[PDB]
Design a protein around this ligand. Structure first.
Ligand code: NAP
Ligand code: FOL
Ligand code: MN
Ligand code: MN
Ligand code: MN
Length: 159
């Protein structure tokens, strides 16, 4: 099973200048809980944005060019990325925009954080078709002293 996990600001913005400009510790904690002990697939730009391997997860990087760091696994196609995960229950695709586009048709589950923040960005989450997806979990949180925007955790499963 393939799942996508992402945090979206208004208008599906996910990034600007290879960064995420907001800071929502509660959402990073949600990301860690839902990815720990699973393989994570990311594109090369997202690998450069994170800047280090994510501990406790098999890190698989898509790039058309040879890898430059043996602490992670480098693959050259979507099919190779999936195969490199082995026989696991759930593969987590962690972006970015181009990678989400390619895996969305293959995904059964979406873990989405909707952030009430207006962000100029240059990268968006794919338009998906709402009729294809059932919301099975949602949890709203107001802003607090640690998290400066309100946010909604949602899990959707392909119908
Ligand atoms: N809010 C969120 O949840 C979230 C999550 C993740 C990322 N982001 C943001 O998203 C932005 C990065 O997204 P992006 O769309 O620019 O880049 P990306 O999807 O992270 O990476 C694209 C790169 O991945 C490689 N790639 C993708 N598909 C491939 C394929 N089928 N075969 C081989 N290589 C492939 C290519 O690398 P080569 O050029 O080396 O071939 C391509 O240039 C950043 O702003 C980041 O902060 C946000
Ligand atoms: N919901 C969501 N939020 C995100 O921030 C997110 N980020 C990415 C890609 N970028 C990043 C950037 C940093 C870390 C990171 O530092 N993670 C630590 C945080 C642990 C914690 O804060 O409790 C980790 O171990 O996962 C992860 C992914 C992909 N999907 C996402 N999905
Ligand atoms: Mn092929
Ligand atoms: Mn197999
Ligand atoms: Mn806000």
């Amino acid at each position: 099973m393939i799942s996508l996990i992402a945090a979206l600001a208004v208008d599906r913005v996910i990034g600007m200048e290879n960064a995420m400009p907001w800071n929502l510790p509660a959402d990073l904690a949600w990301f860690k809980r839902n990815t720990l002990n699973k393989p994570v697939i990311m594109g090369r730009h997202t690998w450069e944005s994170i800047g280090r391997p994510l501990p406790g997860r098999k890190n698989i990087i898509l790039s058309s060019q040879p890898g430059t760091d043996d602490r992670v696994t480098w693959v050259k196609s979507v099919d190779e990325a999936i195969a490199a995960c082995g026989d696991v229950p759930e593969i987590m695709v962690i972006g970015g925009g181009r990678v989400y586009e390619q895996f969305l048709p293959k995904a059964q589950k979406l873990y989405l954080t909707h952030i009430d923040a207006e962000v100029e960005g240059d990268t968006h989450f794919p338009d998906y078709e709402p009729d294809d997806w059932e919301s099975v979990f949602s949890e709203f949180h107001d802003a607090d002293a640690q998290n400066s925007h309100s946010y909604c955790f949602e899990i959707l499963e392909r119908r």
